[PDB]
Amino acid sequence: QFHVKSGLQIKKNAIIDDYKVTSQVLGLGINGKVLQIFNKRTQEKFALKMLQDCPKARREVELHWRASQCPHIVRIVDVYENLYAGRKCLLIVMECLDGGELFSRIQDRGDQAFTEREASEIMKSIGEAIQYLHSINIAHRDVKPENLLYTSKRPNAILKLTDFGFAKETTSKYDKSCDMWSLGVIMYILLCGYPPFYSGQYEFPNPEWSEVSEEVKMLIRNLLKTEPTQRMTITEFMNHPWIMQSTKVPQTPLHTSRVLKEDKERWEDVKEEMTSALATMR
Amino acid sequence: QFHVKSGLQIKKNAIIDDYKVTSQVLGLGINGKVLQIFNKRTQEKFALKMLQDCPKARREVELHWRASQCPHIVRIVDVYENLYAGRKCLLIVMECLDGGELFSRIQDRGDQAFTEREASEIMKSIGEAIQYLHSINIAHRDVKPENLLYTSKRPNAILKLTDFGFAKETTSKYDKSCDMWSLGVIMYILLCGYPPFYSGQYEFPNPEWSEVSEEVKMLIRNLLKTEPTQRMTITEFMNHPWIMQSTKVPQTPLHTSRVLKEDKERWEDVKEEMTSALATMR
Amino acid sequence: QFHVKSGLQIKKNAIIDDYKVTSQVLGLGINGKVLQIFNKRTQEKFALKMLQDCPKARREVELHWRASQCPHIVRIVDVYENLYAGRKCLLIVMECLDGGELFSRIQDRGDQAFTEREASEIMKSIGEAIQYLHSINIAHRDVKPENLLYTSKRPNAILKLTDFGFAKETTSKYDKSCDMWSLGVIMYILLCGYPPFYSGQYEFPNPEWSEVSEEVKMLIRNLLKTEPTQRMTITEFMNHPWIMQSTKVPQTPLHTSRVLKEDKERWEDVKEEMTSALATMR
Ligand SMILES: COc1ccc2sc3c(c2c1)NC[C@@H](CN)NC3=O
Ligand SMILES: COc1ccc2sc3c(c2c1)NC[C@@H](CN)NC3=O
Numbered sequence: 001q002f003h004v005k006s007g008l009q010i011k012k013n014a015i016i017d018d019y020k021v022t023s024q025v026l027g028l029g030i031n032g033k034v035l036q037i038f039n040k041r042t043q044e045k046f047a048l049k050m051l052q053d054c055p056k057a058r059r060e061v062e063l064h065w066r067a068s069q070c071p072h073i074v075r076i077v078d079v080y081e082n083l084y085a086g087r088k089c090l091l092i093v094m095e096c097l098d099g100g101e102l103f104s105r106i107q108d109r110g111d112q113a114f115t116e117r118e119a120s121e122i123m124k125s126i127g128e129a130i131q132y133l134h135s136i137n138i139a140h141r142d143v144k145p146e147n148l149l150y151t152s153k154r155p156n157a158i159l160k161l162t163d164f165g166f167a168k169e170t171t172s173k174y175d176k177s178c179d180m181w182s183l184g185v186i187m188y189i190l191l192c193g194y195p196p197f198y199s200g201q202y203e204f205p206n207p208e209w210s211e212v213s214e215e216v217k218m219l220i221r222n223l224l225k226t227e228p229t230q231r232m233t234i235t236e237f238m239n240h241p242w243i244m245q246s247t248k249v250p251q252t253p254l255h256t257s258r259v260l261k262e263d264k265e266r267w268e269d270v271k272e273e274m275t276s277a278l279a280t281m282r
Numbered sequence: 283q284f285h286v287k288s289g290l291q292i293k294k295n296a297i298i299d300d301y302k303v304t305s306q307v308l309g310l311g312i313n314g315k316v317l318q319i320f321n322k323r324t325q326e327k328f329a330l331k332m333l334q335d336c337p338k339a340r341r342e343v344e345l346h347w348r349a350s351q352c353p354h355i356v357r358i359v360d361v362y363e364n365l366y367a368g369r370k371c372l373l374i375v376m377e378c379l380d381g382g383e384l385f386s387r388i389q390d391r392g393d394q395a396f397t398e399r400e401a402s403e404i405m406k407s408i409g410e411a412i413q414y415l416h417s418i419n420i421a422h423r424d425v426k427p428e429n430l431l432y433t434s435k436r437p438n439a440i441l442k443l444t445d446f447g448f449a450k451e452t453t454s455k456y457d458k459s460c461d462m463w464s465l466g467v468i469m470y471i472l473l474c475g476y477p478p479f480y481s482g483q484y485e486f487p488n489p490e491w492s493e494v495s496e497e498v499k500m501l502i503r504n505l506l507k508t509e510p511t512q513r514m515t516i517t518e519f520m521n522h523p524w525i526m527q528s529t530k531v532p533q534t535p536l537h538t539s540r541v542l543k544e545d546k547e548r549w550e551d552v553k554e555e556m557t558s559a560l561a562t563m564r
Numbered sequence: 565q566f567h568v569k570s571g572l573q574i575k576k577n578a579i580i581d582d583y584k585v586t587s588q589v590l591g592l593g594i595n596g597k598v599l600q601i602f603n604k605r606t607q608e609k610f611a612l613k614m615l616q617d618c619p620k621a622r623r624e625v626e627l628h629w630r631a632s633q634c635p636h637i638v639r640i641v642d643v644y645e646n647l648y649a650g651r652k653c654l655l656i657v658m659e660c661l662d663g664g665e666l667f668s669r670i671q672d673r674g675d676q677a678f679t680e681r682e683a684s685e686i687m688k689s690i691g692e693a694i695q696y697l698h699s700i701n702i703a704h705r706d707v708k709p710e711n712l713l714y715t716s717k718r719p720n721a722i723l724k725l726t727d728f729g730f731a732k733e734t735t736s737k738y739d740k741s742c743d744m745w746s747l748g749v750i751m752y753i754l755l756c757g758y759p760p761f762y763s764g765q766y767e768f769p770n771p772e773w774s775e776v777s778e779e780v781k782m783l784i785r786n787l788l789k790t791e792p793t794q795r796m797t798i799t800e801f802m803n804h805p806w807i808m809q810s811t812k813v814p815q816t817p818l819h820t821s822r823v824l825k826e827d828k829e830r831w832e833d834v835k836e837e838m839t840s841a842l843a844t845m846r
């Protein structure tokens with residue numbers, strides 16, 4: 001009848017008491033690396049981000065905390081303030097994710113190809129995550145495809161959203177629209193294997209974009225509106241059939257996997273271009 | 283030889299661990315309701331206010347904390363920061379008070395009537411509370427007669443002051459005078475059954491104000507000075523005989539109880555008028 | 565392979581639970597006294613500073629915390645926020661030091677006299693302390709000779725630096741140079757028994773300054789540069805031989821002890837003059 005979750009708690013004791021810290025790096029986001037780490041008690045593996053600990057981070061995380069309560073958002077599990085170098089630091093410990101960047105898992109599918117229906121499901125999820133955040137006044141402002149990772153390597157495995165180095169509180173032309181834009185961008189790459197390309201016209205090649213119902217190409221439109229306005233709100237985005245169908249989407253073959261294999265070098269391009277497009281994007 | 287009280291402590295674990303939360307509402311102050319709540323361990327009843335948890339509250343309470351150390355001020359007992367809606371919240375747990383708004387207890391006295399001496403004692407107490415606060419640089423700025431409640435329903439029961447939604451630190455024409463004004467207003471209503479009435483002249487009717495020594499009507503004056511200045515300081519207020527007499531005051535009958543019965547509808551008027559007069563009052 | 569120290573932790577429970585507080589005063593620095601105090605558990609003696617607890621202190625200590633991890637800097641051991649007077653207070657508990665103000669220990673040497681080599685060692689240490697702080701962006705801004713005290717009264721005993729009422733974070737003509745200046749001043753008094761004297765020329769009398777190698781008188785120079793610039797950086801200061809020699813310095817007799825006995829009244833002069841020179845010094 002009445003339900004709360006514990007507030008955020010900045011543990012002061014040395015993280016080394018509770019965890020055994022490796023040096024094996026995993027992630028390499030904004031500040032510092034993401035080290036693998038093990039829980040002495042339970043003995044499971046964890047992710048360790050490390051922060052300077054100044055007002056900024058201290059709030060950035062403050063949000064992640066609020067965010068973790070969501071499925072498709074990566075869960076924070078412990079937050080410590082210790083003294084590293086000589087520096088009031090900030091170690092946030094979160095569920096390690098052994099799944100690889102959303103896309104990096106599609107180009108090792110190997111067997112068969114990808115599905116319009118599988119694309120939905122992916123997008124579908126990603127949608128959710130943003131919703132929640134927005135639905136609590138949070139703009140992620142960095143929904144790149146590196147920042148999406150899966151829990152494990154099983155195809156049942158789910159993926160979550162990470163790196164709040166960029167999020168901001170939409171408190172008290174606007175803001176939480178990048179998050180949409182991205183989804184758009186994300187969907188594109190998801191279906192074909194590439195984005196736009198300027199600094200806006202995005203064509204839809206034959207060998208890829210075919211009988212792919214204009215209903216879909218519609219979405220991508222509404223989302224990509226180089227406008228900040230009329231960029232289909234997430235609330236909106238979710239409502240649109242394709243998404244909330246999950247399974248009522250065409251089973252169409254998708255070249256994307258193979259496409260990605262086609263020039264794995266045209267990628268560290270894409271990923272930077274994504275950080276290019278965003279980050280600055282107001 | 284050396285005496286301190288524990289500092290304020292923002293518990294992070296779910297309040298639901300330590301208390302069992304009802305839904306039975308009691309108070310309906312500023313932010314949210316005041317739910318009844320029970321201590322799992324001891325099993326006694328408690329009051330639960332709930333707050334947005336932003337810098338403001340976080341200090342408002344910070345004061346209440348300092349204030350509770352007083353008898354006639356309602357004691358805070360636990361303060362939690364949990365996550366409700368999706369909202370860093372702030373649950374303050376305090377001694378439940380089963381006594382009813384100061385005045386609401388006088389019009390069910392039924393047996394006999396009220397006493398000039400009983401009025402003192404009441405005022406007397408209320409005085410104290412303000413003192414303390416002032417004596418530590420705190421302006422309550424909302425000493426309405428709803429914000430005064432008794433611990434229990436026994437006539438031995440004492441009353442305390444509540445709702446710090448309004449208090450401010452008189453740190454480093456002025457401020458903590460409203461608190462006086464109010465007392466004045468409070469005394470009036472206490473003796474007769476009504477206040478002033480404009481947006482200042484306050485008459486003193488026959489069937490009420492009689493041989494009621496001008497020494498008393500004096501007080502009320504000094505307090506009500508539509509001035510901010512020459513409004514008798516509390517330090518002053520306490521010194522004046524009538525107050526610090528408690529028992530040396532005339533035993534005069536007071537119609538107030540009956541008066542209040544006389545138009546219980548002319549009341550939600552009074553109470554709002556009190557919030558009117560105050561709140562804005564600089 | 566991976567090393568951290570616990571972060572700073574503001575205990576909320578009454579310090580009286582963990583320690584038994586005396587009233588025996590020891591230090592009389594900036595805010596309040598420094599009381600002797602005993603650890604109930606272990607039962608050893610401790611120093612207790614007490615603070616108003618406002619943003620300022622709360623950071624001043626925040627630094628001391630980071631600083632204590634150093635040998636020659638006095639270690640903080642516990643920090644409490646309790647409610648004294650009626651005042652959110654701040655009790656910092658640190659290693660008591662039974663050694664007396666650096667200089668106050670030299671004029672009770674009695675046996676023999678002081679050594680150019682002993683002076684080094686002293687300066688040498690003091691140097692270190694500053695280094696660390698600087699080396700983590702901290703200006704002490706108050707390196708007076710009262711703020712240096714020894715752990716015990718044994719000549720093996722070491723001395724440390726105290727009172728961070730003045731320190732500031734050199735974050736993001738300048739600042740952490742006073743700390744140098746002082747050392748200079750300190751060295752002078754250390755070798756002879758007096759400072760400068762204006763509001764700049766410092767002479768070097770016969771009966772004191774003799775065959776005392778110009779290499780030494782050089783130091784003092786570079787340090788005392790009434791400039792803020794070309795005041796020999798600490799990094800620099802440490803590198804200079806005399807210092808990092810410890811034992812390769814001449815064994816020269818020093819009159820300083822006797823000198824100090826010579827007019828112990830010309831001292832509360834010196835010490836204030838030191839606070840004069842500093843404190844304001846930008
Ligand atoms: C591997 O398990 C994890 C778990 C959490 C997190 S958070 C995070 C990670 C990362 C990796 N990796 C680096 C980037 C995303 N590429 N940004 C981040 O903050
Ligand atoms: C019933 O036990 C309690 C105990 C504490 C408190 S505080 C508080 C209460 C209230 C009621 N009631 C609502 C108004 C006062 N009318 N404001 C407040 O903050």
Ligand SMILES: COc1ccc2sc3c(c2c1)NC[C@@H](CN)NC3=O
Pocket residue numbers: 590591592593594598611613638658659660661662710711712713726727728
């Ligand atoms: C005796 O054991 C101690 C231990 C720590 C500290 S800190 C401190 C002390 C003092 C004395 N004494 C007063 C002045 C320095 N003279 N300033 C300070 O803050």
